[PDB]
Design a protein around this ligand. Structure first.
Ligand SMILES: *[C@@H]1O[C@H](CO)[C@@H](O)[C@H](O)[C@H]1NC(C)=O
Ligand SMILES: *[C@@H]1O[C@H](CO)[C@@H](O)[C@H](O)[C@H]1NC(C)=O
Lengths: 49, 34
C-alpha cells in the first residue's frame, strides 16, 4: 500500500477508532503506524502484519 | 464585568495519559517534586 506517500505491507481491516478532524495516522507503543484514514472515502482502516 | 488570567510557559517534560478513545485525561509534571 501507498497511503498519501506512506508505503508499506500488510492486511487492511475495517476499524472502529474515531480520529479527530486534524488527524490522519495513528501509532502504537513501538511507534509504528497502526491505523490510517482513506483519503477518498474517509473511512478508517487498521493495518496488521 | 469579567476577569482574565495570564501565565507564562517554560520548557518542561510531561507524562500524559491517553484513554481508550484517544482523549488526554491525566498528566504528570516531572520537574515538580521528587
Ligand atoms: C473522492 O471521490 C469519492 C468518490 O469516489 C468521494 O466519496 C470523495 O469525497 C472524494 N474525495 C474526498 C476528499 O472527499
Ligand atoms: C470510548 O470508547 C468506548 C469503547 O472503546 C465507548 O464505549 C465509549 O462510548 C467511547 N467514548 C465516547 C464515544 O465518548
Amino acid at each position: 500500500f501507498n497511503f498519501n506517500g506512506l508505503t508499506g505491507t500488510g492486511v487492511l481491516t475495517e476499524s472502529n477508532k474515531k480520529f479527530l478532524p486534524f488527524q490522519q495516522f495513528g501509532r502504537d507503543i513501538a511507534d509504528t503506524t497502526d491505523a490510517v484514514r482513506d483519503p477518498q472515502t474517509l473511512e478508517i482502516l487498521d493495518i496488521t502484519p | 464585568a469579567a476577569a482574565y488570567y495570564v501565565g507564562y510557559l517554560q520548557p518542561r517534560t510531561f507524562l500524559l495519559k491517553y484513554n481508550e478513545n484517544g482523549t488526554i485525561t491525566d498528566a504528570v509534571d516531572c520537574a515538580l517534586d521528587p
